[PDB]
Design a protein around this ligand. Structure first.
Ligand code: ADP
Ligand code: FE2
Length: 567
């Protein structure tokens, strides 16, 4: 047995802390810190709880680990940008795995893995494909924002990098901030781009070529020597530039006491919808730049399989278009493309270095905590709420869904990454023409223009989608076929695009069953599947989490374990 605990998250100036445990190349456990702490984005923290969970889940202690792997070259970053790496391996271990939570007889080997390598590792080793081109597109690793590499024979070899100042991630963030959606919500920007019109995709900043892009707005060698990313530098350049060329100035945040809620709430001066054309344009500029990069690495390696990771990898809209490109046959992007994924990537890199074979993820991301019926009961009995234990839960849930009701679904092991995949999901009819507005405005109280996405049986996805492939992670848009382009109004765009999760019975028997039962009711085993949370809070993880969010939202029912709660 080779056991490698991979980590991300650090007390100084970090985000998306997470922890993954590989055992014999298999994922034993994987969790994001935010899910357990309830603090969004897992900011400025070692993945303390996530690692504790991995170890408990696998019944291990630190002393049972062959290696601890960290998904950045921290010593390097501390050398170049802070004037020295002051930590012994043991001292660093004390910070990443505090002894009061993680008792240990001795230190495990500590490995720092280069940030993009980890990103790449988390794509390649888990793709189930044995070779391909690697495209890593990011905010910024230690010094680079893009990495093009060749993945073959269990090896990842770098061909080229792009300096952070030219970051597509930072660009897209900055635009996201400029619009008032916020730099921490780029996904929203993507959503918004769909409502805009693109005028000049260069933004008078980018110049696109056949190998990607160049950004004459900023000197590519511009370092913010103070910090250890070029975020501030790119932020000034982009904000001043956008204000010059775009009709709207930066949207501003407004903080006022709301007597209705009894607190200071943050709002935006302008409606971010006003910025839709700027979103469209940013989206298009990102796509264009990324199309170039993809073509370039594909051709430099002579592969037709593409691997994508780094946070830009979360842009399903851009991925869908990569997939349909003539330069692309197959595509894998892991559900943990962002930094949460570099704990797993670091682990994989190390495990591979230690002689392990890494198994494929295989159409599921359900690696987080799960809870026994007794545990769920404990959480239920805490609330003093009445609940049933349906003979056939999956059928009853299907019936509620078919009737246009919204059902919280908390089953098995939490999924990892930003997307609910039927372990912690809010479910609704994919068939209702009013469901989208209902969930947006009445249920989640979020923006009217936000889109929804479907889960469907893999077994019918060939009839529903123009591509007969696995889409396990909702990480890629594709188009529906004619016969379904109006059947599914809540989850299909006017242009027939959608962002689907395909569901194998192996991946999720319960979800699979529920969908099957739904098909027997409304013809298609397809439903609307949106993240289970009140907006701005992370996806629920524990039954107590589920009950809390259920109690605060006008959801109709909660299916948590084998129990069903109604309002
Ligand atoms: N849907 C999206 N489309 C485009 N870019 C995105 C999207 N989601 C996240 N990003 C980008 O990913 C970046 C974060 O990447 P990540 O690898 O998680 O961390 P880091 O950049 O610190 O290495 C952000 O700069 C953000 O702009
Ligand atoms: Fe990254």
């Amino acid at each position: 047995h080779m056991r490698v605990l991979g980590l991300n998250g650090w007390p100084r100036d970090f985000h998306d802390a997470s922890a993954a445990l590989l055992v014999d190349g298999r994922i034993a456990a994987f969790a994001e810190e935010e899910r357990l702490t309830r603090k969004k984005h897992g900011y400025n923290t070692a993945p303390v709880q996530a690692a504790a969970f991995c170890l408990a889940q696998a019944g291990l202690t630190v002393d049972d680990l062959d290696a601890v792997a960290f998904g950045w070259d921290l010593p390097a970053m501390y050398r170049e940008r802070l004037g020295g790496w002051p930590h012994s391996d043991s001292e660093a271990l004390d910070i990443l795995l505090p002894r009061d939570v993680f008792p240990r007889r001795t230190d495990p080997p500590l490995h720092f893995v280069q940030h993009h390598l980890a990103h790449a590792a988390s794509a390649y080793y888990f793709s189930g494909e044995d070779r391909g081109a690697v495209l890593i597109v990011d905010g910024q690793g230690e010094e680079e924002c893009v990495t093009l590499a060749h993945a073959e024979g269990g090896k990842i070899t770098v061909l080229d990098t792009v300096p952070g100042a030219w970051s597509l991630g930072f660009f897209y963030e900055h635009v996201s901030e400029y619009t008032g959606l916020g730099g921490d919500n780029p996904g929203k920007l993507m959503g918004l781009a769909a409502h805009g019109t693109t005028v000049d995709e260069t933004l008078s900043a980018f110049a696109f070529d056949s190998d990607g892009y160049r950004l004459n707005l900023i000197d590519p060698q511009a370092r913010d020597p103070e910090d250890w990313d070029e975020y501030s530098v790119t932020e000034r350049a982009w904000f001043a530039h956008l204000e010059r060329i775009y009709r709207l100035p930066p949207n501003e945040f407004v903080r006022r006491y709301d007597p209705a809620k009894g607190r200071v709430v943050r709002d935006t001066r302008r409606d971010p919808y006003e910025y839709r054309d700027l979103a469209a344009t940013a989206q298009a500029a990102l796509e264009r730049a990324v199309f170039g990069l993809a073509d370039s690495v594909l051709a430099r390696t002579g592969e037709r399989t593409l691997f994508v990771a780094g946070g830009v990898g979360l842009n399903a809209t851009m991925n869908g278009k990569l997939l349909t490109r003539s330069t692309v046959d197959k595509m894998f992007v892991p559900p943990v493309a962002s930094d949460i994924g570099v704990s797993l990537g670091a682990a994989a890199a190390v495990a591979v270095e230690l002689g392990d074979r890494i198994a494929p993820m295989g159409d599921t991301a359900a690696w987080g905590p799960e809870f026994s019926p007794d545990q769920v009961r404990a959480a239920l009995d805490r609330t003093g709420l009445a609940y049933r234990e349906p003979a056939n839960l999956e059928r009853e849930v299907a019936a509620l869904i078919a009737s246009g009701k919204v059902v919280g679904w908390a089953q098995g092991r939490g999924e990892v990454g930003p997307r609910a995949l039927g372990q912690r999901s809010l479910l609704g009819s994919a068939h209702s023409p009013t469901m989208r507005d209902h969930i947006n405005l009445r249920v989640k109280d979020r923006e009217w223009w936000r889109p929804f996405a479907p889960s469907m049986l893999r077994s019918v996805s060939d009839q529903v989608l123009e591509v007969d492939a696995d889409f396990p992670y909702m990480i890629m848009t594709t188009k529906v076929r004619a016969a379904y382009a109006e059947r599914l109004p809540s989850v299909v765009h006017e242009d027939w695009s959608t962002r689907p999760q395909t569901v194998t019975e192996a991946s999720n028997p319960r979800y699979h069953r529920m969908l099957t039962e739904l098909g027997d009711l409304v013809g298609d085993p397809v439903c609307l599947n949106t993240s289970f949370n009140d907006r701005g809070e992370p996806i629920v993880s524990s039954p107590a989490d589920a009950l809390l969010t259920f109690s605060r939202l006008p959801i109709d029912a909660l299916a948590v374990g084998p129990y069903l709660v109604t309002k």
